[PDB]
Design a protein around this ligand. Structure first.
Ligand SMILES: *P(=O)(O)OCC(C)(C)[C@H](O)C(=O)NCCC(=O)NCCSC(=O)CCCCCCCCCCCCC
Ligand code: SF4
Ligand code: SF4
Ligand code: SF4
Ligand code: SF4
Ligand code: FES
Ligand SMILES: [Zn+2]
Lengths: 115, 88, 117, 49, 111, 154, 711, 41
């Protein structure tokens, strides 16, 4: 067959919640380990602290998931997004599209038009 | 025996069905005539809809409002339940 | 909107011919028209003026056929009743027809829509 | 209704006669037995033949 | 190009068939009854940067109004020059009518 | 707190000045519902927007009834951004990316299940049913012992 | 009983005396039709519904064949294929080749059933040509193109039976039979535009709609009509920014596939005199304002005036929805006001019927109840100009049954027959004491209908006690286990919903307190005495009309084709609109405007979203959360208190009942701004049957035509 | 950026036929895969 690429990971299902628990930590660790390496690959002018902050928030939005089959789709997406980033397939515009650098009240929203 | 000065409207939410006991309809059947005669200037809005837990609202001055459920109350217990609302 | 080539709706007609037609003077204005040759702009002739210079095709038959005269090149063949004392018009091309039974009435009207002759 | 086609045959090659009435009640059973037990179960009890 | 009858009347009657069949939604048409009660377009736009030049619009015309000219040399300096309104399309027919007629004459029996 | 606009909902690359404030979004803790809208990739605007689930009524202009057969799911028009006129040609612009989309379902339940799983807000209207009544051609000619209430004309 | 037949091999049951075509719609079997309509009499003319039936030498018209005990019917046999192909050949032989110039294209039964049931090619090529007939003038609304007619008779049956307008007919004979009026005369019926939709083909089309749209480019929105009190179910057809036409849609409980002309043809007033920006009156001129500098200018005025209890006054108009009244009731209540008026005359004082029991102010026997009605008394209402499609239902029940109608009030030209009993309360008192009261007493399903004009009258106090006293005297006829003889008819969409939540002046003590800050919530027909000259006037609405032009500040709100607002119709049905388009310019949603100003005035309202306000709505009356349905009044007999006990000593004046609708075409801001209604009124004033009366088109006296429509 | 369109997509799907144009078709199953029919008497 054709060779899987450098960070290609075989798609496998989580055995139990302990499996998923350990994989999510492995994925979060691997992301924040790579933040210094992302910065010089993509010439990020922000410091690495901001990059790791964004990694933390992406993981935090899936914090309250209690379904193995939703976590494994999520562990799939991060694996592909990690592989995509580390092999430098995406470019600076894609990585900067990921950093964003709604009205806070009804009355603020009303006065400007909806938002 | 009219209401206390300050009650701006009464609002009963009950249902036609026996799903909830007939006591609110029994109290309103008897109360609403005399409880409207003694003070005609106040709206006692009788509003009903299928599967509505019995309940009563008193709206007071400057927009304030008090709610109390009528669920499980009897035609007498419901009477004092409204009575504390319009007596002060 | 200095020249007449930027005001007149068409070379053959000055005013608009539809309810919703934006006047030329209201559409040749703005920054997009500040270094522009107005007479070089597309300014086609109004068909509403042209069709009404056609003279009436007189006929004795109750019902006339119009296919646009082009054979397959024209338009779908239709039939126009000529019974009202009024010039009957083809709905596709606007050509005017009248019935000779109204020749005396139409040649009495103070004005008309198409040249009777 | 593959178990059914195995039970009683087909308009081309019927298995048993199904003559008149009392054959219809067998006809529904062939469909009913298919809906209650499938092909693997059908081959299990009839055996290997 | 938009074409006219031998009398100078527009052939277009606003049926909207070409707007419907377009595979690229490059045609926008608005119609009304004209001052004389005629069914005529008020808007007629072709986005020449959306068009795919398939000819489906001239295929569907009931009255041979919309045609594609034999002209290919009309390259422009800006894309606004490629947004044709009814004023530009009638002007195209008014200029190109002798070929448009000779092409239809030569190609009509096969249609 | 009783269906409240949450003003701390995070924004993503797809939020514009026409995105509604959301009452709630899926997070994957909800019971028995697959949180598809959390993992679908659609923006959060899809969970701040209510859909309409209904069977289209027969058009007044025709007697055919094939477009009444199924259940349709559409996206409601918002107050701003649905249409505005382009300054150049007068074409009608838009900022609503759901305006040209609709889904079709076999039953009402399927539409609810899909909207629940996608995180849509959703409103259902029920179809108005025809009231049956026998129609007899012979009613056209019934005898009248007294005053004719109208003169039938066929 | 339901007899049993087999259609296309499948078994179907249906009541005997049904048409065989009817048994087909029950059996899910499609049968082609042109002349047959479910809402009309069977005509038998088209021959497109011929099917095969056993023991039958020739094909039978399925529309006109009575279902027999055990028939076997084939709708898909070689006999039916041969008949449908042959009848299509006949209907298409003198039909004009005008599918490109016709407004029925893409929505045509003749092309859809020609494509499905006819041959692909015509065999008609005669050198003699096709039949051509001349066009006709039947008023300013219905453009004629009569070559297209297929002689189905749907419009003549509708005009004569449904609408009571016996001017349309079919003169002639043979292939020269022609639908039209003999004399060139206008069609005078408020249900007129319904023949446009009934017309299978585009011979009878809409003048305002002509050539503007095609059906495939139209977005379809299922909404509610707000131009009267019935809440007719409509389909709103939009092409982007603009509404194009208003169609009826089926609701047998409400409108029965019909809408009136004002509901239909006033949509062109949704684009003409709109409010898009806040205007502050400065030095006698209206200048544009930012929303902030308009709400601040409002807040400053309120702070300066310091209105005590009930010097804040709110008047609500015909088109206001319940999300606004419930939001405005909560704003005024926290400002210290209970002064919540209504736009009609007498809308700023306590009403003769109260609002405690819903049965006081509803159409309690349903609109569907007229389907059974045996005796109907009318009290001060013209059912034609108030509820035009409800007026038709009365006629329908009258033609097919022994229904007796009498009325009290101003005589009106009617589509049904009735007895005029008088014009005032003395006449009504004799009416009930006399033969019609005994007719009302003796009948099953008796029906008294009070119009909202009575509630506007000097003697509504006395009228409403007189009627209810008759009802209470005559229960077990009027107040049975399944019947309610008492009805109040509303002619405005906002008014039953206003009653539903108490948006009404509670006492004359409130009504006697002169306000200094008046909000006109969509109010434009307000009496000049209900608005102080020195009060600070705020107008909220969508049209620049009588209300906006006397105000100090105007706030642009939404119209009903651009909001999702709840409306309660005259019988207490709770319905919601659906926005067909977005908001114009800088207009806002009305309940958001009211919520926005509650910030500036110092008392913000708890809700920030429509769901939070609809939760508020459902605990004012929980029926407002049950959409599309009518809740039954549990304590029905409690209606005696406000109707009789509260209305006993009334200074009766004897003034006769009035005609509250002077001009049907002009009843609200949208209608008064419609060019199409302006032509309807002007043609009706002079009788010009001409189609291009104030419209584009050539005429004999207009050789060159005109671009102007409505002038 | 969030998607704005100078001209919004025009969905002409609402122009679909109000009448069903294809019908049910035909059955073409061979007799060898149909159940038997009980012959009379
Ligand atoms: P502790 O017991 O608190 O354990 C914490 C965790 C997070 C494990 C939770 O308790 C937990 O089990 N929750 C459910 C699992 C979860 O949080 N999510 C599933 C993991 S996949 C995921 O979250 C993917 C996030 C997005 C992709 C990775 C982030 C990086 C994105 C790109 C960064 C920058 C690139 C340019
Ligand atoms: S198809 Fe041809 S005639 Fe019809 S609207 Fe389009 S251009 Fe005009
Ligand atoms: S040729 Fe161009 S304009 Fe005509 S249909 Fe094709 S893409 Fe549209
Ligand atoms: S009614 Fe109009 S669209 Fe239908 S077939 Fe006739 S001409 Fe064509
Ligand atoms: S005008 Fe229309 S409805 Fe009337 S007979 Fe002709 S086709 Fe039928
Ligand atoms: S539908 Fe039965 S004949 Fe016209
Ligand atoms: Zn012609």
């Amino acid at each position: 067959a054709v060779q899987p690429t450098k960070f290609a990971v075989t798609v496998r299902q989580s055995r139990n919640w302990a499996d998923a628990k350990q994989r999510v930590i492995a994925a979060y660790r691997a992301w924040i380990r790579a933040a210094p390496e992302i910065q010089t690959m993509y010439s990020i002018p922000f410091p690495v602290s901001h990059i790791r902050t964004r990694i933390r928030q992406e993981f935090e939005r899936h914090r309250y998931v209690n379904k193995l089959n939703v976590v494994d789709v999520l562990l799939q997406q991060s694996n592909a997004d990690f592989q995509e980033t580390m092999n430098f397939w995406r470019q600076q515009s894609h990585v900067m599209a990921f950093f964003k650098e709604l009205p806070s009240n009804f009355i603020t929203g009303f006065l400007e038009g909806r938002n | 025996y009219a209401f206390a000065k300050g009650v701006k409207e009464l609002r009963f939410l009950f249902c036609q069905t026996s799903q909830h006991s007939a006591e609110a309809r029994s109290f309103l059947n008897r109360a609403y005539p005399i409880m409207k005669k003694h003070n005609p200037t106040i709206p006692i809005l009788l509003r009903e809809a299928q599967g509505t837990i019995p309940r009563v609202y008193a709206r007071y001055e400057f927009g304030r409002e008090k709610m109390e459920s009528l669920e499980g109350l009897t035609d007498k217990q419901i009477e004092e339940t409204v009575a504390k609302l319009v007596k002060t | 909107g200095r020249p007449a080539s930027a005001v007149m709706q068409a070379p053959n007609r000055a005013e608009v011919w539809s309810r919703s037609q934006r006047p030329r003077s209201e559409a040749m204005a703005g920054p997009r028209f500040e270094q522009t040759d107005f007479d070089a702009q597309p300014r086609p002739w109004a068909a509403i003026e042209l069709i009404h210079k056609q003279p009436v095709r007189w006929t004795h038959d109750r019902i006339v056929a119009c296919d646009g005269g082009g054979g397959p090149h024209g338009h779908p063949k239709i039939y126009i009743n000529t019974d009202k004392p009024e010039i009957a018009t083809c709905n596709y091309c606007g050509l005017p027809f009248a019935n000779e039974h109204h020749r005396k009435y139409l040649e009495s009207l103070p004005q008309t829509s198409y040249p009777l002759n | 209704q593959q178990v059914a086609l195995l039970s009683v045959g087909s308009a081309a090659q019927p298995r048993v006669e199904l003559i008149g009435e009392e054959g219809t009640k067998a006809l529904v059973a062939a469909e009913e037995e298919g809906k209650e037990k499938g092909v693997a179960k059908y081959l299990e009890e009839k055996g290997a033949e | 190009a938009l074409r006219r009858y031998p009398s100078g009347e527009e052939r277009c009657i606003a049926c909207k068939l070409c707007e419907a069949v377009c595979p690229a939604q490059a045609i926008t048409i608005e119609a009304e009854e004209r001052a004389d009660g005629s069914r005529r377009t008020t808007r007629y736009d072709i986005d020449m940067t959306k068009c795919i030049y398939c000819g489906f619009c001239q295929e569907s015309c009931p009255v041979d109004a919309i045609v594609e000219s034999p002209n290919a040399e009309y390259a422009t300096e800006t894309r606004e020059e490629l947004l044709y309104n009814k004023e530009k399309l009638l002007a195209n027919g008014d200029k190109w009518e002798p070929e448009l007629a000779a092409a239809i004459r030569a190609d009509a029996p096969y249609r | 707190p009783r269906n409240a606009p949450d003003y701390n909902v995070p924004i993503d690359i797809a939020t514009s000045t026409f995105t509604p404030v959301p009452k709630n979004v899926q997070d994957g803790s909800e019971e028995n519902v697959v949180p598809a809208g959390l993992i679908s990739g659609a923006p959060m605007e899809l969970q701040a927007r209510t859909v309409r689930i209904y069977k289209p009524a027969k058009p007044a202009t025709q007697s055919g009834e094939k477009n009444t057969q199924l259940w349709r799911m559409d996206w409601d028009v918002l107050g701003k951004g649905h249409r505005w006129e382009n300054p150049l040609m007068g074409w009608q612009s838009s900022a609503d990316f759901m305006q040209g989309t609709h889904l079709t379902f076999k039953t009402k339940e399927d539409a609810i299940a899909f909207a629940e799983k996608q995180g849509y807000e959703y409103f259902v209207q029920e179809p108005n049913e025809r009231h049956f009544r026998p129609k007899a051609y012979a009613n056209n000619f019934l005898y009248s012992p007294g005053k004719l209430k109208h003169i039938r004309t066929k | 009983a339901e007899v049993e037949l087999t259609i296309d091999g499948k078994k179907v049951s249906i009541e005997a005396g049904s048409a065989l075509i009817q048994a087909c719609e029950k059996a899910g079997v499609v049968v082609p039709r042109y002349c047959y309509h479910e809402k009309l009499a069977i005509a038998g003319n088209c021959r497109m519904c011929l099917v095969e039936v056993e023991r039958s030498p020739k094909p039978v018209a399925s529309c006109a064949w009575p279902v027999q005990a055990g028939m076997v019917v084939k709708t898909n046999s070689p006999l039916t294929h041969k008949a449908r192909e042959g009848v299509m050949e006949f209907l298409l032989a003198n039909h004009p080749l005008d599918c490109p110039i016709c407004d029925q294209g893409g929505e045509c039964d003749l092309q859809d059933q020609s494509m499905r049931y006819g041959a692909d090619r015509g065999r008609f090529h005669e050198i003699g040509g096709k039949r051509a007939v001349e066009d006709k003038n039947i008023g300013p609304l219905i453009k004629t193109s009569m070559n297209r007619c297929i002689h189905c008779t749907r419009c003549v049956r509708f005009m004569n039976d449904i609408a009571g307008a016996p001017e349309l007919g079919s003169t002639g004979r043979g292939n020269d039979l022609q639908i039209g009026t003999y004399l060139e005369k206008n069609l005078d019926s408020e249900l007129s535009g319904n023949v446009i939709d009934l017309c299978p083909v585009g011979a009878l089309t809409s003048k305002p709609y002509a050539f503007r749209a095609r059906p495939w480019e139209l977005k379809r929105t299922e909404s509610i009509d707000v131009l009267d009190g019935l809440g007719s179910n409509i389909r709103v057809d939009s092409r982007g920014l603009e509404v194009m036409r208003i169609l009826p849609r089926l609701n047998d409980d409400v409108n029965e596939e019909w809408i009136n002309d004002k509901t239909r043809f006033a949509c062109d007033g949704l684009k003409t005199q709109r409010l898009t920006m806040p205007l502050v009156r400065r030095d006698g001129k209206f200048e544009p304002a930012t929303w902030e500098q308009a709400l601040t200018e409002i807040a400053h005025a309120y702070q300066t005036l310091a209105p005590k209890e009930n010097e804040f006054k709110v008047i609500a108009g015909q088109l206001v929805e319940v999300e606004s009244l419930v939001a405005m009731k909560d704003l005024a209540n926290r400002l210290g006001s209970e002064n919540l008026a209504l736009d009609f005359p007498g809308g700023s004082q306590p009403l003769a019927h109260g609002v405690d029991i819903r049965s006081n102010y509803l159409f309690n026997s349903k609109i569907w109840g007229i389907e059974e009605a045996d005796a109907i008394l009318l009290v001060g209402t013209n059912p034609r100009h108030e509820a035009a499609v409800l007026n038709a239902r009365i006629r329908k029940q009258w033609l097919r049954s022994d229904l007796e109608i009498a009325a009290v009030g101003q005589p009106w030209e009617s589509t049904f027959d009735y007895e005029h009993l008088g014009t005032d309360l003395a006449a009504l008192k004799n009416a009930l004491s006399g033969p019609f009261g005994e007719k009302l007493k003796k009948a099953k399903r008796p029906m008294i209908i009070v119009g909202s004009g009575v509630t506007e009258h000097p003697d509504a106090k006395a009228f409403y006690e007189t009627v209810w006293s008759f009802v209470e005297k005559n229960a077990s006829n009027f107040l049975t286990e399944e019947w309610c003889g008492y009805n109040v008819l509303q002619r405005a969409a906002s008014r039953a919903g206003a009653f539903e939540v108490g948006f009404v002046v509670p006492s004359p003590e409130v009504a006697a307190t002169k306000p200094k800050f008046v909000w006109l919530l969509g109010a434009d027909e307000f009496d000049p005495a209900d608005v102080p000259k020195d009060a600070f006037i705020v107008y909220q609405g969508h049209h620049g009309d009588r209300g906006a032009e006397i105000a100090d500040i105007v706030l642009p709100g939404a119209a009903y084709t651009e909001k999702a607002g709840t409306y309660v119709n005259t019988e207490g049905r709770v319905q919601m609109t659906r926005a067909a388009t977005g908001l114009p310019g800088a207009a806002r949603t009305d309940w958001k405007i009211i919520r926005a100003v509650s910030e500036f005035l110092g008392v913000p309202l708890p809700y920030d979203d429509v769901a939070q306000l609809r939760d508020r709505m459902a605990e004012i009356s929980p029926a407002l959360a049950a959409y599309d349905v009518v809740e039954p009044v549990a304590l029905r007999h409690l209606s005696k208190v406000q109707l009789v006990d509260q209305n006993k000593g009334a200074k009766v004046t004897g003034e006769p009942l009035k005609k509250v609708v002077e001009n049907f075409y002009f009843t609200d801001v949208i209608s008064r701004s419609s060019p199409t209604m302006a032509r309807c009124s002007a043609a009706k004033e002079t009788g010009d049957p001409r189609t291009n009366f104030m419209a584009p088109g050539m005429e004999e006296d207009r050789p060159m035509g005109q671009i102007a429509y409505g002038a | 950026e969030p998607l704005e369109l100078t001209q919004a997509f025009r969905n002409f799907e609402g122009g679909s036929s109000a009448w069903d144009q294809v019908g049910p078709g035909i059955d073409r199953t061979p007799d060898t895969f149909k159940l038997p029919t009980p012959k009379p008497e």
